[PDB]
């Protein structure tokens, strides 16, 4: 795996810094670079492919070494070093989508393809070459067992969970009671809805609570909290928790009086939020708790007070919502965000050779379920494949 | 080039040059030892009788211009760690060579056609057969007829 | 175009890697590639501006090489070559507001400007230096034909088009039906509406579609998909076709029954989803096909079946929407989108020098009338001038 | 702050870089910086912390220097650089977490730890390298007075102000008019209502205004600008302006007629963009003035004409919005945004270790505090608070 | 592909140039040429075929070089090149046909096939012969990125698309009114038709108009511009547009009154031509846009004017069609026309050996499905698919 | 007119012909007129267009001679040889347009640009080559 990013940073930096007419001092340390690179090569044959629509292709190597002398180079120098560099680029390419494709239930983490088990050994160790990208600087430190973290901006670290709990409820579906919320992407917006607008609760205000568990710890989340989820907030009629029948939802909007927000790591209270709204921030969470409450209004102009009267006949439904954003995140885990393109990656290689459905992953890649149910030979899978990703995004565009 | 030198195993079919080119990336280099891996004789009856005959390039001597090529890059070329008088001597004595260009392509083209007109009166078959005993030469003799 | 990079790059290097101190070692190299600069670019007259109220300046270049003496950089040396480094430095700002500024209909790939017309020669070719930012990349990989992908985050490949459709319509406008539509930057927000709820529809089912037809091929995109488009589910008042009078829309919002969205890449079914929410993978496509359909509730409680008479009077109408928001994407053609400024610059240095419209580009350099008629020609200029905005943008923060 | 960016960034290359079974060429450059920082801080006693629970440590550096005589760096090699490096790592560390935590009104600009202050000699000058990353280029261009620009993809340059005002007002609240606005993170959403449908203004038109005066200047700004602000239209009701009573809003929503966004630097029109929506372009600005307004409809359907009657009751309320999102702005400040998560490790440190409220930052670091009242002392212990974060996010993950 | 065409433009010239009796002279470049082939070519071992009913052949490669010693060229030196032309024919047509039948979506203009994957080394670069073919010269100044041309003659640039158009049209058809339209080939055949005669229309005259848009931009075609477009001339009867019922077309025919053909690119007029018939050019275009009008003859005999009454019952339509063939045409992308044999031999290649669909071609190779989708990937494989059955069809006859 | 088809002529072999890696023998008979014409054509200066909006080009040929030294073409011959082909071929392209603009009632046979008058000398005669066409 670290001889695998040493093959390809080399391959991106011979494509970048031998060019034509460029000095031999700026590529004068990376010359001899490919050139161990060719040396420790040379006599090896490998084999890409064989799984799925993968094509087996047999890779051998007979290179000559780049020692002419030039002080600038020229352009045959620049055409045989491409020449070498598209044979190299094609080989690793097959690699990385060798690699990318298979997976273990038994040790996820060790290096599947037949190709990356035949670079793991000490006579390729030579190759090896700076790790200043993200995902091999964590992959070497996690290999040490040292702190990592992947800097996310949006992550994925929420499963499409779109349901409703009816606190208050009848087979009329007139006077109900409890909460919706929508868990998608980086975003919670829940809404806490009362029919009667708390006419009967003690001291006119109805106490709603919405308590998402996460799967992998977040670290140093900036998280937009702003109120009224605007989801919620236009009428619809929503099937019962059954499916037999459905029921009308005419919301009404007042304000959450009273939120609080708290970050939870091990039932740990490690940050709190009292009616604070715009950008917040939570240090080290791996829950996430939202107490509003709906207050009736105690003073109302007479375009309010025909709304809620005391009777049954409701039109008109308080409701009482929250949106939580989180912006950017830190997590030791890897996962999926709005940023990189690294999940595409895998899903592209998997979906484009006509791959069956193995014992880890879930099938056609789906995050839902795979970060539903995110075990740690799941998350080993998941960091090898999504490492061997970068490396080919590195290489390939 | 900086290479390690080549321990040759007897057993193979391959002469160094034919490895070597294999193993060295240059284009001016290479040329040369791509025409000695496949200059050999051409065999062809003319008027009945077989002849071994060289290539257009050592007929018209056109080739030492590429070896001329070959040699002064190895002039220009720094080596990484012979001690320098030994290397200023082998880099001006490559240019002992180098700088006979045409007196070498005009000896290069006489010698072929000396060798064209007097194969002209064999009549009897070229055979090319690895005699036993051999006619020995000493490359101190090529080095005078060089300079 | 690969010198101005090689420029700048050395340029910002020697701003970066020449400090007070430092140790020589580290500058060893850059300081013969910023020699080598000087030595090809001494005896040279450039000529940059003149159109619309770019000033016109002329560049004359004689100066004296940097010391190759120290073995810690001391102030004298910093000091110079800050000296020699600001002038450079605003020559290649005026050579790049020169050529961004500049566009032609014939072939746009090649430079315009006569300051970087005259960097095209191989005299200045010993200039080169490593290419190693995305646009310079691509630049030299497209300069000879070979595959490129620019990674955008949210790219601007929708122009702005809000309309709808009347699959069914009267001039009462009481009894209509037919989908709306948001296209906006990389949203899609669509809503099928009936104001019958399929009374009379077979099956009580109405069909749906929205066809998206895309003008560059995208290339493993990360696609939100979310249920309910929040923009068409309050009332609003809506011009006609004609613009002759206005029409009520009042939804009430069922989910979207059999959502089927489909990739296609020339009328080709490349990836298909089928009630699949969340986030969604689309490895290679250039249309989106959402096909959704309104099922009227065979159930429905009493607060419901209000809503959805039998008769004519529909004061609540049935409507039902799709989201879909692509998060990131590779594009072989260069675009815009909510991470890069390059399109900022562009607009920045045309309209700060007052310049007039030329054969290309839109007037006021509308990026709705830009990539509603994105044609090759427009693409080459578009490529180049974000080529050479990335390159200032380097150099002028 | 030059030399410890320079500490840094030769322990994250002396991790990448000296790796198992590297060439020496690669490192070659690497391990005299890295020796000459072992030769300069021998001999050397720091003192980090002292302040909330920041434990006190010492620090005292005797370390020998690294061999220079391999061709391919073993594995001895790698433990002691590995050890090495830990030791200088955690060094690092805590000098940025003793230099996050304190400020100064006076002069925040220059060092207030201890251990930096002892940093800013001249006999740790021979430390430093290059100053590659955004924030040690921008302090390096600041310490001499030179144009800065830190790119932000959408800066949380709006402070969350969430308010309306009425310009026609009375105690019954059922004839209203005025507009309602939402500044949150990088996102303004305006919307002006009128009870009355301008059926008594002149020519059934009426205009509203909302002006957004910023802190610091933004500059080259793509804006995604698009009609029709989504939370000011579903009903909901609100408090008053002293608190006392509750009024209620039932929009029914226009399209913005006659839409000026005006982008003022100094009370000077820089960009104008009169009816375009979709992304914009706002070159250099620090005021947004949106100038749209309510035109009553000439000719309306039977399900429009019910609405808006001439009388008093107004079941129906007209509303017409707009939304303007920031996507990213180059801004001479520092500032908080989606992208960075600097903001999130600065809390993060004054957060963990129980930091008592200084003279400058606001009480636990409430950014719409900050941002509100945004004073030059207060920006410039921003920026080098934040310059340390990004020095201690490029060692500690 | 360069060295490809090279071996067939030597063993084309070998069965050309050498021949029995002919003098040295003559040859004595092309032997020089024909060793270096040998010489480049023994020691190597290739394999053909693997996809369909293509046999797997290996090809192995030991001769000897041939005789530069004859002054007139014998027979047994024409015998002995005859086998080893021979050998080296059977080769490259199975390599042609080996590179033919594959494709890629990724990149097409890369070699598909082993064994021209394994001919684009430097290794067997010294092949390499002229490259005076229309095709690998376009191949070779596209690999550097300048303009290219093919010259067609009648290309099939249209999709095959025979429809129509009612502009005025009712259930009982028999007073219609509409265009149609043949488009195959080069051949646009345009028909409008009114049955009226506009007597009813403004000023006598019905004014009809046909856009044509084109999938590649062509340049410099000389065009036959004729009237009275011949198949649209004869009564028939045509199916609805639903395909319910048919309705019956009985034309009698005008002259087409203020013809107006104009060449669009981008929008852009650049060339028109008001009522000139016969030859036309068109120097740059992308879309076509027909303009003809019908004009009522205000004067007319009594065999005409009991033709078109006033009342309803017309049995006699008026119809006026224009008929537009591109004779030749300089296009820069590969296309069909009826001049070469290049997409015949392709699809004979790839129908003779049963080649399963892949994901580019349309399958059965249909023409008119790949000009309607005419993408820049599948533009990329039908360049080169196109290439190797040129240098095919110089060897194989 | 005999020239102008003798400068295009080389310049289309020499795009063919002078191509990467080939045999020094397939060229050896097109370098020598590609010299002869580089060797007649420097020192001299030309004046392309000037009717209608096709915009006067100065010409100027100052270009040093092709090698004759190598074996097999290396790519150093070949970026020369395509910088000297791109100039001539842009040279050659204006003088065309120059010619197939302008016309005469009187002689129309003969040259009527500048260029193609000039071209029309003895001095040029030399750079002529095959008329295969
Ligand atoms: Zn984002």
């Given at each position: 795996?670290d001889?695998?990013?040493?093959?390809?940073?080399?391959?991106?930096?011979?494509?970048?810094?031998?060019?034509?007419?460029?000095?031999?001092?700026?590529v004068?340390?990376l010359?001899?670079?490919?050139?161990?690179?060719?040396?420790?090569?040379?006599?090896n044959?490998?084999?890409?492919?064989?799984?799925?629509?993968?094509?087996?292709?047999?890779?051998?190597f007979?290179?000559?070494?780049?020692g002419?002398?030039?002080?600038?180079?020229?352009?045959?120098?620049?055409?045989?070093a491409?020449?070498?560099?598209?044979?190299?680029?094609?080989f690793?390419?097959?690699?990385?989508?060798?690699?990318m494709?298979?997976?273990?239930?038994?040790?996820?983490?060790?290096?599947?393809?037949?190709?990356?088990?035949?670079?793991?050994?000490?006579?390729?160790?030579?190759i090896?070459?700076?790790?200043?990208?993200?995902?091999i600087?964590?992959?070497?430190?996690?290999?040490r067992?040292?702190?990592?973290?992947f800097?996310?901006?949006?992550?994925?670290?929420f499963?499409?969970?779109?349901?409703?709990?009816?606190?208050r409820?009848?087979?009329?579906?007139?006077n109900?009671?409890?909460?919706?919320?929508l868990?998608?992407?980086?975003?919670?917006?829940?809404?806490?809805?009362?029919?009667?607008?708390?006419?009967?609760?003690?001291?006119?205000?109805?106490?709603?609570?919405?308590?998402?568990?996460?799967?992998?710890?977040?670290?140093?989340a900036?998280?937009?909290?702003?109120?009224?989820?605007?989801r919620?907030?236009?009428?619809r009629?929503?099937?019962?928790?059954?499916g037999?029948?459905?029921?009308?939802?005419?919301?009404?909007?007042?304000?959450?009086?009273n939120?609080e927000?708290?970050?939870?790591?091990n039932?740990?209270?490690?940050?709190?939020?009292?009616a604070?709204?715009?950008?917040?921030?939570?240090?080290?969470?791996?829950?996430?708790?939202?107490?509003?409450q709906?207050?009736?209004?105690?003073?109302?102009?007479?375009?309010?007070?025909?709304?809620?009267?005391?009777?049954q006949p409701?039109?008109?439904?308080?409701?009482?919502?929250?949106?939580?954003?989180?912006?950017?995140?830190?997590?030791?885990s890897?996962?999926?965000?709005?940023?990189?393109?690294?999940?595409?990656?895998?899903?592209?290689?998997?979906?484009?050779?006509?791959?069956?459905?193995?014992?880890?992953?879930?099938?056609?890649?789906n995050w839902?379920?795979?970060?539903?149910?995110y075990?740690?030979?799941?998350?080993?899978?998941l960091?090898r494949?999504?490492?061997?990703?970068?490396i080919?995004?590195?290489?390939?565009? | 080039?900086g290479?390690?030198?080549?321990?040759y195993?007897?057993?193979?079919?391959?002469?160094?040059?034919?490895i070597a080119?294999?193993?060295?990336q240059?284009?001016?280099?290479?040329?040369?030892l791509?025409?000695?891996?496949?200059?050999?004789?051409?065999?062809?009856?003319?008027?009945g009788?077989?002849?071994?005959?060289?290539?257009?390039?050592?007929?018209?001597?056109?080739?030492?211009?590429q070896?001329?090529?070959?040699?002064?890059?190895?002039?220009?070329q720094?080596?990484?760690?012979?001690?320098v008088?030994?290397?200023?001597?082998?880099?001006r004595?490559?240019?002992?060579?180098?700088?006979r260009?045409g007196?070498?392509?005009?000896?290069?083209?006489?010698?072929?056609?000396?060798y064209?007109?007097?194969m002209?009166?064999?009549?009897?078959?070229?055979?090319?057969?690895?005699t036993?005993?051999?006619?020995?030469?000493?490359?101190?003799?090529?080095?005078?007829?060089?300079?």
């Amino acid at each position: 795996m670290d001889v695998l990013y040493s093959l390809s940073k080399t391959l991106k930096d011979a494509r970048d810094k031998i060019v034509e007419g460029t000095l031999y001092s700026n590529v004068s340390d990376l010359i001899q670079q490919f050139n161990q690179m060719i040396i420790t090569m040379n006599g090896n044959e490998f084999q890409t492919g064989g799984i799925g629509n993968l094509p087996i292709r047999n890779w051998n190597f007979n290179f000559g070494l780049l020692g002419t002398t030039l002080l600038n180079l020229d352009a045959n120098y620049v055409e045989t070093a491409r020449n070498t560099i598209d044979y190299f680029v094609d080989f690793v390419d097959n690699v990385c989508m060798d690699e990318m494709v298979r997976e273990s239930q038994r040790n996820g983490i060790a290096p599947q393809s037949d190709s990356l088990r035949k670079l793991s050994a000490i006579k390729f160790k030579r190759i090896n070459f700076d790790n200043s990208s993200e995902y091999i600087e964590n992959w070497n430190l996690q290999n040490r067992r040292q702190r990592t973290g992947f800097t996310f901006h949006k992550p994925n670290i929420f499963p499409y969970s779109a349901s409703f709990t009816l606190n208050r409820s009848q087979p009329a579906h007139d006077n109900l009671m409890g909460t919706m919320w929508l868990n998608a992407g980086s975003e919670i917006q829940v809404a806490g809805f009362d029919y009667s607008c708390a006419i009967n609760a003690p001291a006119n205000i109805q106490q709603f609570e919405h308590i998402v568990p996460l799967r992998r710890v977040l670290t140093t989340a900036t998280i937009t909290l702003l109120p009224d989820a605007e989801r919620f907030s236009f009428p619809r009629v929503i099937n019962s928790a059954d499916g037999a029948t459905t029921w009308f939802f005419n919301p009404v909007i007042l304000r959450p009086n009273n939120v609080e927000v708290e970050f939870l790591l091990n039932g740990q209270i490690i940050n709190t939020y009292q009616a604070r709204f715009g950008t917040i921030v939570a240090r080290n969470f791996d829950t996430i708790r939202l107490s509003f409450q709906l207050m009736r209004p105690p003073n109302m102009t007479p375009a309010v007070a025909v709304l809620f009267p005391n009777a049954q006949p409701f039109e008109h439904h308080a409701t009482v919502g929250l949106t939580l954003r989180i912006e950017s995140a830190v997590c030791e885990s890897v996962l999926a965000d709005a940023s990189e393109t690294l999940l595409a990656n895998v899903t592209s290689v998997r979906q484009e050779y006509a791959i069956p459905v193995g014992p880890v992953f879930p099938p056609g890649m789906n995050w839902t379920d795979l970060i539903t149910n995110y075990s740690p030979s799941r998350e080993d899978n998941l960091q090898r494949v999504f490492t061997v990703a970068s490396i080919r995004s590195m290489l390939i565009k | 080039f900086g290479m390690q030198r080549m321990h040759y195993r007897n057993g193979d079919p391959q002469t160094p040059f034919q490895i070597a080119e294999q193993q060295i990336q240059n284009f001016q280099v290479a040329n040369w030892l791509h025409f000695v891996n496949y200059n050999q004789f051409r065999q062809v009856v003319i008027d009945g009788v077989l002849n071994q005959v060289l290539n257009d390039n050592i007929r018209n001597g056109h080739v030492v211009n590429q070896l001329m090529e070959a040699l002064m890059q190895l002039s220009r070329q720094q080596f990484p760690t012979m001690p320098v008088d030994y290397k200023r001597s082998i880099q001006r004595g490559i240019l002992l060579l180098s700088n006979r260009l045409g007196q070498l392509v005009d000896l290069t083209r006489l010698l072929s056609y000396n060798y064209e007109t007097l194969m002209a009166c064999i009549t009897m078959n070229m055979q090319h057969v690895q005699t036993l005993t051999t006619e020995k030469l000493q490359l101190t003799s090529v080095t005078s007829l060089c300079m």
